[PDB]
Each structure stands twice: as C-alpha cells, then as structure tokens.
Amino acid sequence: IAPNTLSNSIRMLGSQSPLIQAYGLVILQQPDIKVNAMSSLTNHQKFAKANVREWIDEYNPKLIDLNQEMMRYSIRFNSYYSKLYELAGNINEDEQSKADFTNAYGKLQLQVQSIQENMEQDLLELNRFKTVLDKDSNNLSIKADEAIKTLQGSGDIVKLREDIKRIQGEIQAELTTILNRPQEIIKGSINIGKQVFTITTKTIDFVSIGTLSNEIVNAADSQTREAALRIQQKQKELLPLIQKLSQTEAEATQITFVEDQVSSFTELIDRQITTLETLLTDWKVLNNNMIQIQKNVEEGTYTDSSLLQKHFNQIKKVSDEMNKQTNQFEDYVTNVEVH
C-alpha cells in the first residue's frame, strides 16, 4: 500500500470546483435570447440553464458530502491509530488482543466499504446527468454550425468564430493552470463580467469570466501571475474580433457565445466526473488492500506482528494524506469565491 494510493484526486475535485461554478454562472447570466436564424437556440439555452441549476442543486453537493465523509473517516482512523497500532503488535501475544484488533479494524474497513458504496451510487447518478449534458451540448454545437453556415453569406464569419472560440479555450486552460498550482494558503476570487457591443442600432451582450482577484494577479508564484497576465491580454484580443463578427452578422455572435459557454462548462463537468471515477478506482484498491490485511490476520499469516504494524502504518500514511486533501478540497470550495 503506497502512501500515494489515492493520488491527487480529492484535492483536484476541490480545485476544479470554482471554475465549474464560474463557467456555470456565465451561462446563467448570459441573457435569454431569441435568434431568427436559429429558432432552436432559445430552447437549447433553456436546457443549458436548467442543466447548470441541476448541477448546483442536486449533483455538486454529493461531491461536498463525499468529501466530508472521507474527512470524518480520516479523523476517526487517526484517533484510534495509537491503540490499534499497539493491539496490532500484540496479536500473537494473546488470543484476546487478536480478537480486539480484528473487531476494531473490521469496523474501520466497514466504514471504508460504506464510503465506497456511496461513491459508486454517486457516480451512477452523476453519469446520468453527464449523459444528458454531453448530448445537449453536442446537439447545440451541431445546430450552431448549421445556423452559422446559413448566415455566412459569400469565409469571413467562420474564421472570426473560430478565433473567438480558440481564445476562449486558451483562457479556460490558463484558468485551469492557475487552479492547478500549489497554493500554500488557498484564497482568491473569480468575478464574472458583462460587456456590451453596439452595431447598426442594436446592442450585443457578452458575459464572461472577467477580473481575477489580487491574490492571483499579484501571486508570488511567477507561473500563476504570468498566466493571469496572459488571460488579461486575451480578454482584450476578443474585443475587435467580436465587434467585427457582430457588425458583419449579429446573430452569429449571439449564437457563438451561447454555444461556446455551454461547451466550456460541459468539458469541465466531464473532467470532474472522470476525476471522481479515478478516485473510486483507487479507493477500491485501498479497501481491497485493507480487506486482505483482515483475511491474513484471520488465516494466521502474521506470525510476526511487526509486519502487521508495518502494514498498519502504511494505512496511516494514506489516512494522513486523505485528511490533507479533504481539507484542501474544503478550502477550495470555501475560500476561492465566485461572483
């Protein structure tokens, strides 16, 4: 049993969370729109908003609950460690101690079992949502492409559209890189902004991730700061591209935003669900390993109790790291705020 059994999935589920909350609020806040060139657009947008709220109301808090469960397990385990380490060393010294260790260790394995089963249920329910969302986004992307091709007159609008999407993707990735870096103290803020463009008339709304907090923009960590500066620049690059597209065909802009916003959020949801699957795959390895220790104690394999103490310590190292990462998770979803 490696101290690294559970990799970095617990932490990453936390650090992924503020970006998902931001890209979600962008969808909620982009205004309800009708476009004659794509009459399905209104309904696709309806679905997108309802999906985001489903994630807020129903799904995201499963992840929060899981995390609390793994934290409380690690607290419990750590609280019993010294006495159970001592029992482990005495399993052959007296048949009653062997009883007492197998009883308590067994309860802790049951608790680990119980978290595994909650995880498994969570993931079944989360993949039902992922199925709907992934389909919704792809339907919308397909009808967007089709409406745009009807707008495009006599290569202009496609090129602009692509460049706007390219830059939005580069922003998304830089933001991810920021949230992936080691923060000693986990703190900051992502604000969502609204911009308006004027054509002839009429006005065009553009909601997006706007300003990042002082903690990020002036981070001591040069990779974080530099990534924050690049975001600032790319945000400004969007602005002539959007005016050009909008003045050429305004509905192409309004379609472009909705489809790009939903696709971002969808990508981030997918990645977070994948991260949970990896956590489950690894948690199963831990639990199995724990069950084998159990079986070998009962079958009498530990004729040398110090080898059981060595294995019990290995599990302590995993407990400690679980406590570390669940606390990080909690910090990310508490202290990196989104408005």
Residue numbers in the entry: 16 to 169, 171 to 216, 222 to 360
Quoted passage from the original study:
We report here the crystal structure determination at 2.05 Å resolution of NheA by selenomethione Multiwavelength Anomalous Dispersion (MAD). The NheA crystal structure shows that there are eight copies of the NheA molecule in the asymmetric unit. The tail domain forms the main body of the structure and consists of five major helices designated: αA (Ser 24- Gln 44); αB (Leu 56 – Gly 104) with a distinct kink at residues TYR 95 and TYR 96; αC (Glu 110 - Leu 166) with a kink at residue Leu 141; αF (Ala 271- Glu 319); and αG (Ser 326 – Thr 355). Intriguingly, we show here that in NheA a β-hairpin of similar sequence appears to be held in position by five hydrogen bonds from a short third β-strand that forms the C-terminal of NheA (red).
Nhe is a complex pore-forming toxin (PFT) consisting of three proteins, NheA (41-kDa), NheB (39-kDa), NheC (40-kDa), encoded by one operon containing three genes nheA, nheB and nheC, respectively. Separately, these proteins show no toxicity, but as a binary complex some activities (NheA + NheB: ~5%) were seen and maximal activity is obtained only when all three components are presented (100%).
